[PDB]
Ligand binder design. Structure first.
Ligand code: HEM
Ligand code: HEM
Lengths: 145, 145
């Protein structure tokens, strides 16, 4: 249940999400591309889903990948901004879930983003505590897939 | 080209876009839904394109419409944030253009949003100068359609 998952976002979890986002969200282009390139490097089996973006190995040099990556960071910005109101968080999460259901992405495969998130956070000196908080947010999307 | 349309956005136009967005963008849920409801009220022929959202006459109560409307405002946020780097603006604009090209939305049809934009701006006392500034930003996306 997406509603039960959203209820898992306690005061402490919301605080950790906001605190780490202040840093990570300050460079959407840089960290967004870093997140995607890490996903492709660690889970090569997901590259097929991204055929529209072309040669993802080009990273920042690939205009489609850059546009996609920046936009992905605004979806996370959206989630963070809706933390105060569970009903609004749920409706935006369901909107993005549809974007992935149409691409045949399961909850299990969506969860593969947790590895990359932990690595990007770690590179900015945010440890397991923060990675776990972000995993709880990712779990809200998983509940809708 | 799209780059040409973007590179033409002057310092004054960017200033007007940012000043009006400071206000309109501060209430994404309220102004996003107002923008969509105004589009449906004045251009009823577009209602059919949004069949996925269900009964759009339900307004704020419609969770799918609310989720869509909030997300639309973050696409605008994205554009505003990329104003000083035409290369980044172009790649995000092309990304969103694809979202509309796949739905068979023409450049002329996309321009129908200018009426609702003018009205929403007017509700916050932003006049014709501001409506003209926004029409120039919309024109950047039209260059990609
Ligand atoms: C933090 C997690 C993630 C977020 C917030 C996210 C967000 C997004 C957004 C905003 C889009 C654009 C939607 C559209 O315009 O249609 C997108 C597209 C896509 N996402 Fe994700 N995504 C995430 C993780 C994943 C993962 C882990 C996979 C795959 C295992 C995935 C697969 C896709 C695919 C295939 C597309 C379509 C790309 C294209 O053809 O343009 N996403 N995602
Ligand atoms: C202010 C300009 C506009 C912006 C910011 C914009 C942005 C968006 C965004 C972010 C999406 C979601 C894309 C996706 O996830 O697949 C969307 C979907 C869509 N847009 Fe727009 N749009 C604009 C104007 C228009 C206009 C004028 C029309 C039609 C005359 C239009 C028709 C559509 C349709 C049919 C969808 C698909 C809705 C659905 O089934 O989920 N858009 N738009």
């Amino acid at each position: 249940s997406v509603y039960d998952a959203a209820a898992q976002l306690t005061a402490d979890v919301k605080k950790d999400l906001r605190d780490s986002w202040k840093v990570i969200g300050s460079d959407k282009k840089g960290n967004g591309v870093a997140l995607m390139t890490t996903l492709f490097a660690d889970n090569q089996e997901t590259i097929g889903y991204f055929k529209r973006l072309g040669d993802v190995s080009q990273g920042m040099a690939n205009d489609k990948l850059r546009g996609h990556s920046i936009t992905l960071m605004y979806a996370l910005q959206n989630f963070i901004d809706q933390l105060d109101n569970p009903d609004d968080l749920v409706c935006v999460v369901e909107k993005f879930a549809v974007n992935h259901i149409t691409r045949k992405i399961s909850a299990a495969e969506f969860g593969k983003i947790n590895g990359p998130i932990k690595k990007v956070l770690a590179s900015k000196n945010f440890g397991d505590k923060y990675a776990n908080a972000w995993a709880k947010l990712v779990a809200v999307v998983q509940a809708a897939l």
